[PDB]
Amino acid sequence: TVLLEVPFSARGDRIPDAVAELRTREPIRKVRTITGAEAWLVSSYALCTQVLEDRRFSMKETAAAGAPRLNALTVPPEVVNNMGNIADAGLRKAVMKAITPKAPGLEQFLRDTANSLLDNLITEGAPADLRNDFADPLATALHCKVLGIPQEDGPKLFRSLSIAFMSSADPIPAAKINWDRDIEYMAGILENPNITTGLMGELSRLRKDPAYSHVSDELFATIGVTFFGAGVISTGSFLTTALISLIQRPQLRNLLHEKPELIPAGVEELLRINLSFADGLPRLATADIQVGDVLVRKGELVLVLLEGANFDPEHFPNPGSIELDRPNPTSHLAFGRGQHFCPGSALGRRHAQIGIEALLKKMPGVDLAVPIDQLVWRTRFQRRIPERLPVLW
Numbered sequence: 001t002v003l004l005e006v007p008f009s010a011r012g013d014r015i016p017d018a019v020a021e022l023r024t025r026e027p028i029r030k031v032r033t034i035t036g037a038e039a040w041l042v043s044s045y046a047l048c049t050q051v052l053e054d055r056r057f058s059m060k061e062t063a064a065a066g067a068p069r070l071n072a073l074t075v076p077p078e079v080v081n082n083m084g085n086i087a088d089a090g091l092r093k094a095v096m097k098a099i100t101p102k103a104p105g106l107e108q109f110l111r112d113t114a115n116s117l118l119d120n121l122i123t124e125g126a127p128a129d130l131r132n133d134f135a136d137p138l139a140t141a142l143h144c145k146v147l148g149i150p151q152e153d154g155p156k157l158f159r160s161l162s163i164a165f166m167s168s169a170d171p172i173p174a175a176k177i178n179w180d181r182d183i184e185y186m187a188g189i190l191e192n193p194n195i196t197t198g199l200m201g202e203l204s205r206l207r208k209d210p211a212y213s214h215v216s217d218e219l220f221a222t223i224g225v226t227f228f229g230a231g232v233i234s235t236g237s238f239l240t241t242a243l244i245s246l247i248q249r250p251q252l253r254n255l256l257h258e259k260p261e262l263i264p265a266g267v268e269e270l271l272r273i274n275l276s277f278a279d280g281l282p283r284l285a286t287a288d289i290q291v292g293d294v295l296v297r298k299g300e301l302v303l304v305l306l307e308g309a310n311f312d313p314e315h316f317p318n319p320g321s322i323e324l325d326r327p328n329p330t331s332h333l334a335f336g337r338g339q340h341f342c343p344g345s346a347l348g349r350r351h352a353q354i355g356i357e358a359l360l361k362k363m364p365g366v367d368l369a370v371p372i373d374q375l376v377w378r379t380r381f382q383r384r385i386p387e388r389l390p391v392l393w
């Protein structure tokens, strides 16, 4: 027989039984990626946390030429160290401050947008597609607002992402085409005097500040493109599959409908059991490092399986159950951990909370309009998502 292949399944509505067997029998073990490369798959909470909190397991070095690869690059290799570059340009604080959900009127904008989308769906009548006509438009509108760019520019940038976040064995020509075009767009945004708010407005000001005279224009455009893409794909995909998790639990749906003050904790649990990341987080060992029973050698590829950690019964008892009163509710790895912890976590949380609150208020009887098995799960993608999410109410 051949070496165990990853990923195991593109389905985001259930965790494979094989994961628990793996965690119990071999919480770090050798696998083969789609490129043919070998890697260590880590699937226990303890070892996942160990790996993510040890910077000698490097994100940046995953971009090195000749390295074993999880998948082909869809960005310039320097972009792999994007946050690092941000840090080096002295821009980390401003960027992070710009993408919090705390800006005046941001949450009200989210609510208004969600409510408008839902009103439109209700007017059009069931069935409704909660991905293409709710979650993703909401994410896109949100990130246009956050970046300070026109709403009407959102869809076209959005249309890069189905390619931008592919997980391919080979390089993707369209990915480079779209990348260069979106980069030209963001550079134009930086030169556009009308853009004075949000992330791009702030970057536009800092660009002309003498304290930043030697930061490259490339980096400025790149922040815009990368944060738009990662933010929209992450919030859209998470919200979609969270809505799936919610729909499959009518009792929770009803409870949250009755006591919306419980919605954030619910969202936190929805975060914990979320399967949106299709692959483990990649890291390259820069030294010989002991992980459980395995001595990982310098230059080897390591994959941190988030659902491995988050469904670990040793950290989250009865892991498959949504429990709103856990003693350790935010200790999941849905936003990663350590050096590369998600800078957009608060915004993602608020996006999901407001989207769910609005949905439950508008569509308290929301349910799937097709049998669960009929959902079409996107393959070889960095996220797990159903192509369409047909619902009734």
Ligand code: HEM
Pocket: 059, 082, 083, 084, 099, 226, 227, 228, 230, 231, 232, 234, 235, 238, 239, 281, 282, 333, 334, 335, 336, 337, 339, 340, 341, 342, 343, 344, 345, 347, 348, 349
């Ligand atoms: C539910 C929403 C989200 C989830 C579940 C999520 C998940 C994650 C995870 C697991 C990582 C760590 C990846 C790794 O360490 O290899 C990460 C990092 C990152 N996230 Fe998110 N994210 C979300 C929303 C967002 C948003 C809203 C933005 C931006 C507006 C964003 C931008 C980024 C960026 C740029 C990184 C790279 C950090 C680094 O390289 O140090 N994400 N995210």
Ligand SMILES: Oc1ccc(CNc2[nH]nc(-c3ccc(O)cc3)c2-c2ccc(O)cc2)cc1
Pocket: 062, 063, 073, 074, 075, 079, 080, 082, 083, 160, 164, 165, 166, 179, 182, 225, 226, 227, 228, 229, 230, 282, 382
């Ligand atoms: O070896 C690797 C390679 C890539 C990655 C991150 N994955 C990723 N795939 N696609 C994009 C992307 C985003 C926007 C866009 O217009 C086109 C493509 C990104 C990305 C890049 C930098 C970030 O800071 C965030 C997300 C991690 C390890």
